[PDB]
Symmetry: D4
Subunit: 180 residues, 8 copies
């Protein structure tokens, strides 16, 4: 195939992140060698999810994203059958042991307002918290509750804009934006 | 022997946990290859004990469980001869340097109410704190003092229900429950 | 799913071997959680291939098995376009830099005579060397040329019979044999 | 070349620090083998920058110094395009996610009063925070805001005076002072 | 020589601790193979010093003990020439960046009251803080200021009584006590 | 218990060797804390077995000693069912893939002539090769076939005499000799 | 800059190789970010040099390439002043302790005949051995003496053709060939 | 002290070598901080001894140099009491299990002829093999038997001349030569 995007994704993200995004796509019948613009998105979404859980206390979050589909639903059941939160219809990204809610992390190339509206329409669970990030530096969260401290969220926005700059420096950003 | 339980225990728990539970059973004349349902219990009890001490401050707990019988009693003596707490009749699991008391950790497959009553009858030391966990997500502690924060205890309950789900997914949970 | 085979495969083989066999099946639309008898075969075939290359000199073999389908064909092309050997129709397992030939490694649960005959009918390349191993301790190679020393091949047969014993000790061998 | 300074710098500083200072000089057309007094300064400035970021919270600082010139400006842009701080004219050393400002770290062999005055004249950005350290144990910061706790800044002053003592013990301090 | 004490010291303490105590004795013309009772004391004193600095914040303490005689005095000078504290007459064990004072750590086999009185008579520096521990579980500190939290000091007392029990279990404690 | 032997064994042998000898004794109902003279023998026998297999080629030997009783018999069966050698009545120490025979390694504190005669009377398998070492530097092997090169066997004799010297230097050798 | 070549070079070669080629170019006033086609050549030449020394015995070769210019000439002097070989006019790549000669390794994108002729004209040292490799699988060496075994040289040719295939798969080979 | 030699020795030799030479001098009442020219010699002698044993087979040599005085004599006794070689009067450097003799390694700054004559006069053991190296590239061995292959000895001579060049590049060689 030989995509400049694919080689950039392998140089941009940590090797363990690339491996999980590969397993995530293959589990859903997708090839990172051809769906390279996607490939960059699951890597980006995975890193943001891991930096998100890195914020806060040690035992605060339970990481759902990055596990296999069967195991992620197993941990979701264990969380629901121990706390009492209703089972979400779709797989969330994290669970906040401090606020007692599931968190859906979103990373958008378009306006934060549109994605969240698209995400909120999907999740009929209602109780699931939504937190959206953009590649321009904006963010949007449910009830204006941004969960983490400002410094942890600012670190995520900075990294997102760095991925955007490195992509545009290789003339790959325009195709990345016009693909979501 | 070739027990599905034994292979599940080795896949479910961290290798160091399995090694300590093996040494614990062998020290008391028990073979994990035949007493597989037990084998899963010492592993579960060991992990809960280690996640428990992982909660709280750095120097808060002294881990008694997981040591050899002679060395565990040596540390118990050192704690008693330095603080002044009475020597317990039976080996506890942890010592809380913050609350100045020994902690007995229990993990039950039956109702939390029965196990604690069974545990409290045994410990005539009285001063020893009891903290029970169940595979269904409930917990019971002495004087309603649960020692740790809610997030640390919720992480233990979630892991316990995951072990239950993985066991039932292999048709091994029913024999595990009807063996305590 | 919860298969005793799946847990045995994870306990029997080295973790890196299990990961490569997982990626190998998923690349060809197969799930190790349901195709557990297969899952044990790619792991077994992978280990035999790696012990095979472990025999002989340092730079003797080029390992084709265990790579992704695209990369394995890239190395096959490089070997053909540098030595002059004809491109095989199917992906082989190794290349012998000493004998200047590709090697197809086979591991059979049935009689070695049948598998090799089945393998030789497939490879019209003719030049590709075939080396078959069985779980009973027999082996068969092209032109009676067994490539490696007797000690290296004996180590492979011993390991194969150990996998057979561990499988039969868990009542999983009968289903493994009646599935090839 | 064979400079006593060069061998002292390699023995005094951590190997990773020496490698970054080497790459920093070579990127700007300087050879650490001849510009040995300089070589000791970029190493010293690099370590102080890393101990500075080591103070405070986990996600507090973004380390600009120690990166390549192109990548450091990329992170500066990402910070400016996400928070809104004006782009500084010169490359700073850190960014404080807590106070929302860039920090310029200075290490002087002369009086702290002169260096800061020289530094403040250069940075027309105004918003950039300046923090100066000396090899005698004094420090000077903008608006008397020293950012970190006293213990973290005291650790930096102690290390600086140790470098001075080790240098003077080798008769290399006098040439180091008369070279800034 | 073949001393039971020497083999116990190597089994009781961490290997890095044993190496530093060896270098400490040899620097002062002492052989751990014959002065085995001493050998156990520098190891004990070294571990207590390291557990002491392990208490408190990250940048709180500067470890003087465990360095070579020349380097320890270099760091003492740097601390004195940066904070302003008077140079102590004898080498202390730690410096408290929080309380701005040097700390002398003592471990006694006799009554805590006698050792501290012996230590206080030696240090004419006056400003140096003294903190004594005993193998029986008692402690004594200057101005009743024990610097660390109760849990960190209780961990040190517990370890000291464990060393006493292991020594007495080998009939080596009586000679250890009658040698200070 | 507090045995000088036990502390010497932990200081003399590599930690992994001590762990295997511990598991070996406990599997056969023996406590290394009281049976200390024995404890030194399984450690010595284990190291000699590992240095023995270290001699020769890479795939030459299959290590039977050091495995659990069930797994060692599994590998013995695999070797017998693949080569054709008769199943030995007692567990041997190694299998020689080069000479096609099992090897029984013996380490004696008495005369090599007596032990081998005692060993040969036990093994009715006849085909099993016997190789005896002594703590004085002598050795005896079946059919005068010493399997390995002279340098590898000389390294084993040297190590054995070093263990003897270290034991006698602690007045533990006399009890060690009068206990076989 | 954002070159597809630069990202491919970082994905194709081992990270340590990329670091040495970076230091090699910067030492000679070249930037791998703009001279990307070159950047791929020093990486390729470096790997071939390291695989070359990997062939043969343990102490056979002394690696000159990959060191700094000053240190490489130091080792060249030591080799000349100990064996007696004349000092070469230009820095070679290796020294063969077996054949007692320096080796110049060449990797060409054009015909092997032209490069060697260009190389031989440069080296007036005459005694220096020349060994050329091409990306098509051919090789040329002085006096038809190819130094290493066929398997080691075949491994180098295979890797070279793999780099060519990966480059052409990204449409970067044509610019790579038309740049030597 | 601050010696350019001391800093060069720490930069020139591997850290483990420097630590052993430090322990070797301190065991004999010598300080590497003042006896810096010596300090460079024990490091040089230690490395040559380790490269010497690195030549030849795996179990060929027993390394005597680099151990403590008591332990080195213990291994010497074990070698003498197992092979039968007479106990040497002075501590040798290695034992050759292949040739059955002790080896004394010498490194001279003067003529090889003088040192060996000085060494041979000392060793009345006669059976001990002597092998001398010089910093100019010459060597001298007993009975013209140089033990190792030419390539292994040539690697030692090359390293010795590199140490000489690095020393002379720092104006430290002249004092090093005029101190033996
Ligand atoms: C636990 C393990 C992986 C974790 C994923 C996550 C990765 C974490 C690594 C940290 C350390 N840092 C920071 C510096 C570089 C690095 O590496 N971060 C956070 C930032 C980016 C990153 O990489 N964490 C958190 C706990 C430890 C760990 O590694 N995951 C994967 C999904 C589920 C999960 O918990 N697990 C668990 C089982 C499978 C597996 O792989
Ligand atoms: C200290 C050592 C072992 C400790 C047991 C305990 C294990 C701890 C490991 C941590 C790290 N994590 C977390 C991520 C994975 C991992 O590995 N956790 C906690 C969670 C599960 C787990 O595994 N801890 C705590 C201190 C460091 C350590 O390892 N034990 C064993 C009994 C006594 C004791 O203190 N010791 C001490 C001497 C013998 C020995 O083995
Ligand atoms: C190179 C690397 C992996 C290799 C596979 C192979 C595995 C090898 C590991 C050895 C060490 N041992 C032996 C003891 C345990 C262990 O671990 N053995 C052989 C026995 C079982 C085993 O595991 N080898 C050989 C070279 C080093 C290495 O690891 N592979 C995978 C397919 C292609 C290839 O060459 N590669 C290369 C790129 C991708 C990757 O992963
Ligand atoms: C992240 C990595 C390097 C970091 C530099 C910095 C070094 C840090 C190392 C810590 C651990 N300690 C402390 C004990 C010894 C040690 O080693 N400290 C601080 C004190 C001295 C020192 O060394 N940090 C901080 C995060 C982890 C890390 O290592 N850098 C380099 C410039 C940018 C950056 O963030 N990166 C990032 C990409 C390139 C690279 O190399
Ligand atoms: C820094 C280094 C050594 C430090 C000594 C000290 C040891 C520390 C190690 C920790 C980790 N733990 C805890 C678990 C086991 C372990 O290992 N603890 C504390 C408890 C016992 C122990 O061992 N610390 C503190 C910083 C990191 C480190 O290792 N020292 C030696 C004297 C000066 C000094 O700061 N240095 C510095 C230069 C020379 C050297 O060796
Ligand atoms: C494979 C593994 C352990 C092996 C035992 C054996 C130990 C070997 C270690 C080597 C390396 N050296 C040499 C320097 C120090 C060191 O460490 N030597 C030989 C000398 C002393 C020693 O320690 N070997 C050989 C292969 C690699 C390995 O480690 N064993 C244990 C019994 C069965 C077996 O094969 N296994 C296998 C499964 C269980 C386990 O633990
Ligand atoms: C010694 C060290 C680096 C060596 C370069 C060379 C690299 C070697 C690494 C081997 C292991 N393999 C093989 C598997 C992956 C890996 O990593 N190979 C060979 C194949 C590719 C590769 O990478 N070698 C050889 C000795 C050990 C070592 O690493 N070099 C650099 C120039 C001079 C030199 O001798 N040195 C020496 C001082 C500076 C430095 O860095
Ligand atoms: C065994 C251990 C240390 C050995 C000394 C010796 C060092 C060896 C290290 C090798 C690997 N290489 C090569 C690349 C870099 C490196 O590191 N080389 C040889 C070249 C320079 C060097 O460093 N060897 C040989 C066996 C393994 C080992 O490390 N010694 C010290 C004196 C006695 C002894 O046998 N021991 C034994 C007990 C105390 C101790 O420390
Ligand atoms: C759809 O196929 C895949 C499925 C998974 C696992 C489940 N998906 C998520 O969890 C998830 N996916 C996305 C996402 C990413 C790229 C394109 C489209 C979307 C919608 N954005 C999230 O925020 C999120 O949480 C992983 C990779 C895939 O390619
Ligand atoms: C009984 O034999 C063993 C003894 C030990 C060490 C001492 N036991 C405990 O500390 C302990 N045991 C249990 C426990 C676990 C399984 C079945 C029955 C019980 C009662 N539950 C605890 O809560 C606890 O603290 C370890 C493993 C054994 O199999
Ligand atoms: C078929 O789907 C898969 C394909 C691959 C990669 C290509 N296959 C081989 O290379 C290969 N496969 C087998 C094999 C293994 C199990 C069942 C059936 C067979 C026929 N036996 C070989 O000897 C061999 O060389 C890996 C795992 C798969 O499940
Ligand atoms: C000038 O050439 C180099 C440039 C860099 C990168 C950019 N420079 C800094 O960031 C920087 N330099 C200095 C500095 C250090 C030594 C002498 C003179 C000065 C002025 N003091 C800082 O405080 C600082 O922030 C690194 C090493 C160089 O040699
Ligand atoms: C005296 O010779 C040695 C000197 C040092 C370094 C300086 N000494 C201390 O720092 C120090 N020594 C002791 C100490 C320990 C054992 C016996 C007697 C005493 C008095 N108790 C401390 O509290 C302390 O701080 C180390 C080991 C020695 O053997
Ligand atoms: C007997 O109980 C134990 C059993 C094992 C495993 C099986 N035993 C051997 O394999 C084995 N034992 C011995 C041996 C060692 C000490 C005392 C007596 C003897 C006779 N000498 C061998 O040469 C040998 O091969 C390990 C440790 C034990 O304590
Ligand atoms: C003399 O004091 C020390 C003793 C030792 C251990 C025993 N010495 C040797 O083994 C040894 N010494 C030397 C040597 C080295 C420097 C100056 C003088 C000499 C004569 N040359 C050898 O060849 C050798 O074998 C180590 C370091 C010392 O400083
Ligand atoms: Mn998700
Ligand atoms: Mn999401
Ligand atoms: Mn317990
Ligand atoms: Mn319990
Ligand atoms: Mn295949
Ligand atoms: Mn195959
Ligand atoms: Mn800067
Ligand atoms: Mn600065
Ligand atoms: Mn002290
Ligand atoms: Mn003290
Ligand atoms: Mn045995
Ligand atoms: Mn035996
Ligand atoms: Mn070159
Ligand atoms: Mn070249
Ligand atoms: Mn010597
Ligand atoms: Mn010598």
């Amino acid at each position: 195939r030989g995509s400049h995007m694919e080689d950039f994704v392998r140089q941009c993200f940590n090797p363990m992140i690339v491996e999980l995004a590969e397993k995530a796509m293959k589990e859903y019948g997708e090839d990172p060698k051809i769906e390279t613009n996607k490939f960059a998105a699951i890597c980006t979404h995975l890193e943001v999810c891991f930096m998100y859980s890195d914020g806060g206390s040690k035992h605060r979050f339970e990481i759902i994203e990055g596990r296999d589909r069967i195991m992620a639903w197993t941990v979701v059941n264990s969380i629901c059958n121990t706390t009492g939160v209703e089972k979400p219809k779709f797989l969330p990204d994290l669970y906040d042991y401090k606020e007692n809610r599931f968190i859906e992390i979103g990373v958008t190339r378009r306006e934060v307002h549109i994605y969240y509206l698209e995400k909120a329409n999907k999740i009929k669970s209602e109780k699931t918290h939504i937190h959206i990030f953009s590649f321009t530096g904006e963010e949007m969260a449910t009830k204006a509750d941004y969960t983490l401290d400002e410094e942890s969220r600012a670190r995520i926005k900075t990294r997102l804009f760095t991925i955007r700059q490195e992509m545009a420096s290789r003339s790959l950003w325009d195709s990345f934006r016009q693909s979501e």
